[PDB]
Amino acid sequence: ELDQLRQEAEQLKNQIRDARKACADATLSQITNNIDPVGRIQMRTRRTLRGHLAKIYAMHWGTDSRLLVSASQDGKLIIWDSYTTNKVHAIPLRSSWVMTCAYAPSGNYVACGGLDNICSIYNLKTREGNVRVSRELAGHTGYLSCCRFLDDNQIVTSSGDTTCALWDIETGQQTTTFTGHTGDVMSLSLAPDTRLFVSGACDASAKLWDVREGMCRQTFTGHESDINAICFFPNGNAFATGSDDATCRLFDLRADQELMTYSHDNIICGITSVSFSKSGRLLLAGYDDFNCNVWDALKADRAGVLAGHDNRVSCLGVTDDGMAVATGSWDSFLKIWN
């Protein structure tokens, strides 16, 4: 019955919470209190990428740490060259309202999507030089919030219909649909071993999935508002979530609970983007107060600000070699920090 199952579920839900407390023998701050602090970090702007005439909602680095893609409401993606600021490509888009862009590891395809509900995979290299839609991937009911390639044949996308779908590009059809969320899945991050991925939604839940099995292995509930960003730790056994409550939290899988909470009294605005560094020592986080913050992933110590944007930072990214950090705001600018 509805109440009979609820009694079984409520006791089970209490069991998981109770069993989760049979493991917290110590806290992250206590175990890591006696280490050398990072100290002040003074990273400066090295390049500014002008060219966008509207708000910027996404960017993504390539796997060579040299080429990056940037989406904007002007209706065009731009594949920049961060070393020399040239504009390698400029792809016009059918729909101006785009929320996500992605760059394939092979460097051959670039994806995008937004309120048009369609995922648009573009081909970078072909005959005649022009860049045209390789395939449009529809089937979703809500707005495409995040896209991440797995290979040149697989893409994983999360939308506002509370579901994430895995696609075969050649077929153009969904292979696995991941249900289990009750809200808009606005972020997802891929494990380095491309076998697991996490997703954060407006239900204040960070769910970990299985790319092959299609099931939801764990469910992390420690936040209090909508999770706007999520990113895997470089080891692949932890992730950081940034909600609107001005708090970043570092979770873990083998412990299956929260280990740290990064928050300060002065910062009251939401958290837009979060990513880690190559060593997993620094947690970068974007905010609505127009500046980035550099946190300590092991001491929860605020350690720096990248303040150069007139409007809110909407995206952030760390190169695959730990060489640079790119920041994009609604003021139509990308600043390559270092």
- Residue 302 in the binding site for another protein (CB under 8 A): no
Residues 177-216 that bind another protein (CB under 8 A): 180, 184, 186, 202, 215-216
Site for another protein, residues 44 to 63, rule: CB under 8 A:
46-47, 51, 53-55, 57
Length of the chain in terms of residues written: 338
Site for another protein in 106-125 (CB under 8 A): 114-117
Phi, psi of 219, rounded to the nearest 5 degrees: -145, 115
Place of tokens 């989406």: 71
Binding mask 7-46 for another protein (x = CB under 8 A): -xx--xx-xx--xx-xxxxxxx--xx--x--x--x-x--x
Q: How far is the CB of 121 from another protein (least distance, A)?
A: 19
Residue 143 makes contact with another protein by CB under 8 A: yes
**Interface with another protein (CB under 8 A), residue from 62, 160, 317, 328:** 160
Shortest spacing between CB 170 and another protein, in angstroms: 26
Task: Residue 22: count other Cβ atoms within 10 Å of its Cβ.
Answer: 7
Contact flag: residue 222 with another protein (CB under 8 A): no
Tell me: does residue 88 bind another protein (CB under 8 A).
yes
Work out how close the CB of 254 gets to another protein at its nearest, in angstroms, rounded to a whole number.
5
Binding residue (CB under 8 A) for another protein from 70, 73, 162, 243: 73
Three-state SS annotation for 119-177: EEEEECCCCCCCCCEEEEECCCCCCEEEEEECCCCEEEEEECCCCEEEEECCCCEEEEE
Q: Which among 125, 83, 85 is positioned nearest to 104, based on CA atoms?
A: 125
Contacts 24+ apart (CB under 8 A), 160-167: 160/184, 160/185, 160/186, 162/201, 164/188, 164/199, 164/209, 165/139, 165/140, 166/211, 167/119, 167/137
> Interacting stretch for another protein, rule CB under 8 A, among 93-101, 149-157, 168-176, 190-198?
93-101
Query: Is there binding between residue 321 and another protein (CB under 8 A)?
Result: yes
CB 147 within 8 A of CB 127: no
